[model samples]
Target: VPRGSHMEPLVTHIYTADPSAHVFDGKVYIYPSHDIDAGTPENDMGDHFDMRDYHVLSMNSIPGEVTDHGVALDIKDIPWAGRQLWAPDAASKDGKYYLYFPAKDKEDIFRIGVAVSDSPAGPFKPESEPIKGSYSIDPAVFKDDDGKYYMYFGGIWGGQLQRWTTGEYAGHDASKTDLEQDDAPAIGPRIALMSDDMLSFAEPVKEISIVDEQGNPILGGDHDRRFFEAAWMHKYNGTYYLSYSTGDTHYIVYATGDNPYGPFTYRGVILNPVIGWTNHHSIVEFNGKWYLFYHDSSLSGGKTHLRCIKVTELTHNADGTIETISPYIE
Candidate 1:
């Protein structure tokens, strides 16, 4: 591991973003997307996103330094995926580590893919194809107390696919969808039960509506607070907390519900948008303290696509509401 400061921007070894932290075998392992600086049409990706791989970093404990376990997977290793590798999440089941990610195929549409490795810090091998029955991005998996595995995914524009809105994958009309427009109804996140093998969905996709304490639909408002992308589920004290990044605001907000597939009551923002155009994160507990794992354009000369992972202590109020995260740099 390279020696560096043990503070805010938790990772400096590479331009990494979209932090997904998972606890495996008493250590906190972070799976983050690797950002490269390939400028403009020169890189063949419209010069927008330059991510093509992932890296796994681990820390024995907080107040401690993070170790870069190196590249866990690369785009070249994924046969069916295009060069753009986006946000990814990692989970362990039955002694095997599973990595879920989103990438554009040769078709230029984003789809979620899974990889497997015997070890957490891995050179993961991708399945022959992306996971079937889904057309979206930002895959996140959560294991309930009952041992049931649930996956949450989707994003703005075409990321949610059209299945939930139109009931068919091929017929989604983006014209009718105007979440960001004034009074236009906002789109919610998608969730489904995963097969025990973690290779496929065991159930159909269900849209989780963001509701208020009165159980009223919270969409169609002036400023769309609905989930845009980066779906994450954290179970605490028997409560299912569904947190995600809002589309325009880029705020990391959350809702709480009794069930994993929820009619949730919108809580509040855990993180305000950074100086970057994109924001993705994970919430995990390490050594009895909670931390918000996220990224920003603080590195890479303030470029939006080229970001770096950072961590900050998180705390919950007496009523179970999370305090707003004040992001900082070291």
Candidate 2:
């Protein structure tokens, strides 16, 4: 590790989950699962459950100091989001910024919702209804060359990609389809193409059940386990990199493909906890080097433990795939 800049933690304290990064104004803004009263405070010495509270963190350095502005977009902000706001994702296009997030209005699991603003760090406002409704999370947005937007995300149910068609999802939902949870098999990794408008599906859809020899759904132990959430895609040199998380463990895994939606084969676990359970993470290339962005409990608390943001150079294989990754190099 480099001592000058790499030694300092980008984000600090509490438990941070599903951290997604985007560069704006020459700075990096991180949106993590900000669950308040995490760990022992909520969990009975790690016995019970540590409720997830929705908060947002912001910073402005190539590697910057993260500041928590208590309750950036809470459940109260959007009544439909209920109380728990899980993984929140943001993207900028057409002079407008959009934030799509997974939120729980009540006892239901999670649904996708959109929060829009003029800039990355902004007073984001939520739409009247969620983009996909409950059971959807780890929202990621991508604008294709044809000026079409695509949305991807899911958990135990499976991964889904939608194109914007008519309304909010029309930006990308047109190229994709409305995802109906397929419980036929278990769950693991599933990627599909969206329509041009960003509302429906394109044509033939692909799923993880086809490739998970060990059974994709069984990896995480539960229905939502396995490599089933946080669907993010980055294209490099004609090869597509599909990055996602495996259930609550926080291990962001990756695969490669020649197309946006593909029969992506698994590369390996990108980042796992040396001191934590699961870490939600994303990857971005800055300058000319690829860097891993994720949060771990190495700082304070546990689980939704609001820890510090950690980064390390991301190296790809000769074939352009992520081979192996750990929390910290041994």
Compare the candidates by TM-score and give the number of the best one: 1
**Clash number for candidate 1:** 0
* Lowest-sum lDDT 10-residue window in model 1: 171-180
- lDDT per residue (tens digit) for residues 1-330 in model 1: 332234357776688888899889998888888888777453212236757888888888775678887778889989999767888998899999999999887766677889999999887989979888766778888988899998899876546443346654443344323454545446777888999899888998888878876777776553436777888999777778899887567789889999989978898888888867778889998777888888889877688877888788889876778898857533
lDDT of 2 at 279: 57
- CA error at residue 140 for candidate 2, angstroms: 1.7
- Computed on alpha carbons, the lDDT of every model, listed in order, comes to 0.79, 0.56
Q: Mind giving the per-residue lDDT tens digits that candidate 2 earns over 27-109? A: 66667776445334433122122334545566554555576656556566786756456667777775666777776556443
TM-score of each: 0.90, 0.73
User: Lowest lDDT 10-mer window, candidate 2?
Assistant: 158-167
How high is the lDDT of residue 74 in model 1? 85
Best by lDDT: 1
